[PDB]
Ligand binder design. Structure first.
Ligand code: 2GJ
Ligand code: 2GJ
Lengths: 218, 218
């Protein structure tokens, strides 16, 4: 019996470590990670927007279309949430598999031809750019036709997409939870986040909301 | 400027994690790791034996040719030492790079064609079979023409081959230090090691020594 034929998703976490090494060596300015996450959220928002055009009940799970950035300073986590179409369990497996396969292609090309700062133009590298600032990621998603699921890059053992009985309920859409590297904590600060959004995501056609909790120093 | 072209050694640790996942799924019986380590030691012993044939001073750094297995129960480490030719710093870099490149080939083939228990016949898979029982490895080596060097698969950060100012002095040769998985501690036991050596390494033409420290229970 044969194992792993075509089963690239089984290696998603390992392939991400290869891509993290490449992309962090190539890009010293990490801030483009946020552009890429917002662009992927925008695409998922377009999908629900067009489906709901002929079937508005699809919006009732989360009637507003938005992208929402929530720094969690105590946890050193940056959360990016959208109310896009979301992913069923099978969608999440299939999308991670495609992302993983594109990573193998980008990694093999780096070895054969070398990598430079144009690599951000390659399919899938936008996802891996989250590892410019994060050492670990949780991808949480809720599609109208399925339950809430989560994939954790740091989960020990076999690749798994787990029924989410732990995180807050998304009504619909996707949240990436970025566990930031100790040298990239600037991206938990409101001023820095706003600078990066205005610089790189001006033409995104959805509201980008920033949720900031701070103790009042008295 | 281009990064990583041909620099497969830079990914040795990440490629090993891919190979570890494949080989542990394919092989439920882990014991062949020892056959493969002994076979690589035997090859390095042949090289010093033939060089010393015309230049016996090469043996003076370690005059006996042997393979030596040392369980370190307290550390959950199994050490395999040989008095082979050893590797200079550049040899260790070059051999890890070749091993890493063969891993990329085996991993891509597993995805395209599937992997089965014949994969042990592929170039380089013998090295990766150490991850049947170990989660981490240190490769320590001393060649007559260089200082003692070490590579650590679990060392954080950039691939590096470090001048060894920590471990015991090898006079000449190579030691792999295997940090065993919690479910593979049977391979620290003398009875088990001896069974595996007799079964799989009968035709190795060097003495295989086993060094066992035990408290006398009184
Ligand atoms: C069944 C259809 N479902 C979706 O399209 C969907 N729902 O949520 C998606 C998001 C995925 C990501 C990461 C995992 C790529 C987000 O960061 C944000 C999302 O909303 C998401 C999505 C899926 C794929 C893509 C496009 N690819 C292109 C190649 O790599 C990155 C993503 C963009 C968004
Ligand atoms: C400059 C020449 N130096 C040597 O040949 C040498 N010295 O020490 C060697 C050992 C390497 C390993 C691992 C890292 C492969 C050992 O386990 C034991 C050795 O003695 C070693 C060696 C190097 C290469 C090989 C053969 N390859 C074949 C493909 O993968 C495994 C190793 C076998 C042994």
């Amino acid at each position: 019996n044969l194992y792993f034929q075509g089963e690239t998703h089984e290696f998603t976490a390992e392939i991400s470590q290869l891509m993290s090494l490449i992309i962090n060596t190539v890009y010293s300015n990490k801030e483009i990670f946020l552009r890429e996450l917002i662009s992927n959220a925008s695409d998922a928002l377009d999908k629900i927007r067009y489906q709901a055009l002929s079937d508005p009940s699809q919006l009732e799970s989360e009637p507003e279309l938005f992208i929402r950035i929530i720094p969690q300073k105590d946890q050193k986590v940056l959360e990016i949430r959208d109310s896009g179409i979301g992913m069923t369990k099978a969608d999440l497996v299939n999308n991670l598999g495609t992302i993983a396969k594109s990573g193998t292609k980008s990694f093999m090309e780096a070895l054969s031809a070398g990598a430079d700062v144009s690599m951000i133009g390659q399919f899938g590298v936008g996802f891996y750019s989250l590892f410019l600032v994060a050492d670990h990621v949780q991808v949480i998603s809720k599609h109208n036709d399925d339950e809430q699921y989560v994939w954790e890059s740091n989960a020990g053992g076999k690749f798994t997409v787990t029924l989410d009985e732990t995180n807050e309920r998304l009504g619909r859409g996707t949240m990436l939870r970025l566990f930031l590297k100790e040298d990239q904590l600037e991206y938990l600060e409101e001023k820095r986040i706003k600078e990066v959004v205005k610089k790189h995501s001006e033409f995104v056609a959805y509201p980008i909301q920033l949720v900031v909790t701070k103790e009042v120093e008295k």
